């Protein structure tokens, strides 16, 4: 594979002249821009380009975007046609931001995609003859008034060709038929997921998903479904609930006919005592769960390693809606100890540092401190010119001249279960209308309780206690998040009801003591320790709806 080698050594190597050379190969047709002509940017001139191009959040350029979505030429902003929007996690004062793009998005995760599976494979053997059970979804668009489809990044993807005439090889190379991952009910695809993998289980060498918090569901779904899934095996007949034709006939073909012997044969494994080890007792020649670990998704792993008798834990690429940044060129290592390595091709990258260890202003991919925090600044071919990303990375290495980046966090996110990413923002603005009914019925903090799926959130209060006024305390502070919250938790059952636990009096004071121990109260609380104080300080809880 001598190929992938050189095609690394060079792309890890020629850091600095491959960003210049992406940065002019963007700029130059995109001078006539309404956009650019607005910073005069009238030719590739790097220092012009860095001196009098603003830096911009999603909030400064929304009026350029909210144009471009409305249905006016793609020209304000990219000489690159805009055929679509990505529909970010990240929001805006509630809505869900809406990030400009085109087929450029999918020719680099493309690349990635490409890129990641020789990774693994230079890795890990025993995988090019087998299939993957990929717990893959597709989410159904949202449509604008221009007529474009706004997506989830990995949905564009799925859509499309891309998708579609992917290549024929074992990493493109599901047990899932494409009818199964194109299905916009996430419950009926989930299901049949479980069923086609548990009939080709022989044939998985690899399981995942784009997310840990979905791979955990996988499995808890498939502990409350297993007698299900089994009949379906028996009888050769997919169940009548899921309405899905594409499902329909697609699974009936993998099923083919009843299977009482493979039947009884998972059913006796699903009955053993413990759910330990589950996924590689029902799929022996999986090799590795290909997952991202890193984050918040790191509350994750131990569930994982519990179900997965301590497979590897592959976490390969970090990415987001203005961008894909990197890969992990290390994947056999613990979550932990997962870096992101940049690829020079993706887009042109900058970075504002996020401590003292940098004292620059801004500075280029390949001048970036060890040890130091950044925020990414993104310059795409969709029409985005140095936008900040909200997310906090740390250098902690380079491949050649390619730096590592570890992800630290989502800044300003203070509660995370699967996809949503609850901004302190949003958890301000709903424990004030839980203070209105607190105010008329009769401090705080937040956790992400993950200990049951789904996994829900917890908001200490400090107020016997009506349960009509905290009951509706936990709806208003519910009903007051953001749509990724609401999909995940209202439809795809990824999340369980708010809980609300109210505090002992001055446990909002001598919790002023916790961090005093080590002013501002914390909005989240991760420490296990001091997660202690305040479960034993909780009077009552109550629950949403
Ligand atoms: N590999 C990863 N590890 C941790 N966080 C990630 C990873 N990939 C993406 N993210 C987070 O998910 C976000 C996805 O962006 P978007 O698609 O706009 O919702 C990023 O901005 C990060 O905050
Ligand atoms: O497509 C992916 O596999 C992916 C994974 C992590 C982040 C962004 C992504 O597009």
């Known amino acids: 594979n001598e190929t992938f080698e050189k095609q690394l050594k060079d792309?890890?190597?020629?850091?600095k002249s491959i960003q210049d050379n992406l940065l002019e190969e963007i700029i130059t047709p995109n001078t006539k821009t309404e956009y650019l002509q607005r910073f005069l940017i009238d030719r590739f001139d790097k220092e012009l380009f860095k001196k009098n191009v603003p830096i911009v959040s999603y909030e400064d350029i929304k009026p350029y975007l909210d144009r471009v979505v409305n249905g006016e030429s793609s020209d304000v902003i990219s000489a690159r046609t805009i055929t679509g929007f990505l529909l970010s996690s990240g929001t805006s004062g509630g809505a869900q931001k809406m990030m400009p793009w085109n087929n450029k998005y999918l020719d680099n995760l493309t690349f990635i995609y490409d890129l990641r599976m020789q990774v693994i494979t230079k890795h890990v053997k025993g995988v090019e003859e087998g299939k993957g059970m990929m717990?893959?979804?597709?989410?159904?668009?949202?449509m604008t008034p221009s007529g474009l489809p706004a997506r989830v990044a990995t949905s564009s993807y799925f859509k499309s060709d891309y998708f579609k005439n992917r290549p024929s090889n074992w990493y493109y190379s599901y047990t899932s038929p494409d009818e199964v991952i194109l299905c916009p009910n996430n419950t009926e695809s989930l299901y049949c997921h479980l069923l086609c993998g548990l009939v080709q289980r022989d044939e998985v060498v690899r399981t995942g998903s784009i997310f840990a918090s979905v791979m955990v569901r996988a499995i808890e779904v498939l502990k409350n479904s297993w007698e299900e899934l089994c009949s379906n095996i028996r009888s050769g007949h997919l169940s009548n609930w899921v309405t899905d034709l594409g499902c329909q006939n697609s699974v009936s073909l993998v099923l083919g006919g009843p299977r009482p012997e493979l039947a009884d044969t998972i059913e006796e494994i699903c009955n053993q005592n413990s759910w330990k080890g589950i996924v590689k007792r029902l799929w022996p020649n999986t090799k590795y769960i290909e997952t991202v670990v890193t984050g918040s998704m790191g509350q994750y792993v131990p569930?994982?390693?519990?179900?997965?008798?301590?497979?590897?834990?592959?976490s390969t690429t970090y990415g987001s809606s203005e961008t894909t940044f990197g890969i992990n060129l290390d994947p056999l290592c613990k979550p932990e100890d997962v870096s992101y390595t940049f690829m020079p091709n993706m887009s042109y990258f900058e970075f504002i540092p996020m401590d003292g260890g940098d004292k620059n202003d801004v500075v280029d991919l390949e001048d970036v401190k060890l040890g130091c925090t950044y925020e990414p600044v993104v310059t795409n071919f969709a029409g985005l010119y140095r936008m900040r990303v909200g997310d906090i990375v740390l250098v902690t290495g380079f491949y050649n001249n390619a730096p590592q980046f570890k992800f630290v966090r989502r800044e300003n996110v203070v509660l995370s279960i699967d996809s949503d990413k609850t901004n302190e923002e949003d958890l301000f603005k709903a424990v004030s209308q839980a203070k209105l009914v607190?105010?008329?019925?009769?401090?705080?903090?937040?956790?992400?309780?993950?200990?049951?799926f789904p996994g829900h959130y917890?908001?200490?209060?400090?107020?016997?206690?009506?349960?009509?006024?905290?009951?509706?305390?936990?709806?208003?502070?519910?009903?007051?998040?953001?749509?990724?919250?609401?999909?995940?938790r209202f439809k795809d059952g990824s999340i369980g009801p708010l809980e609300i636990r109210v505090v002992r009096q001055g446990t909002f004071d001598s919790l002023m003591d916790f961090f005093i121990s080590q002013y501002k109260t914390p909005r989240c609380i991760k420490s296990g320790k001091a997660l202690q104080?305040?479960?034993?300080?909780?009077?009552?809880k109550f629950f949403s709806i």
């Not at 792309?11 to 850091?15: C, D, G, Q, R």
């Not at 607190?438 to 049951?452: I, K, M, P, Q």
């Open 11 to 15: 792309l890890t190597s020629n850091v």
């Open 135 to 142: 717990f893959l979804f597709t989410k159904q668009e949202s």
């Open 303 to 314: 569930m994982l390693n519990y179900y997965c008798n301590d497979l590897p834990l592959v």
């Open 438 to 452: 607190l105010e008329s019925s009769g401090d705080f903090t937040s956790y992400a309780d993950t200990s049951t």
């Open 458 to 488: 917890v908001v200490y209060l400090e107020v016997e206690l009506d349960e009509e006024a905290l009951s509706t305390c936990c709806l208003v502070m519910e009903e007051s998040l953001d749509n990724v919250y609401k999909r995940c």
């Open 533 to 540: 104080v305040l479960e034993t300080c909780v009077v009552a």
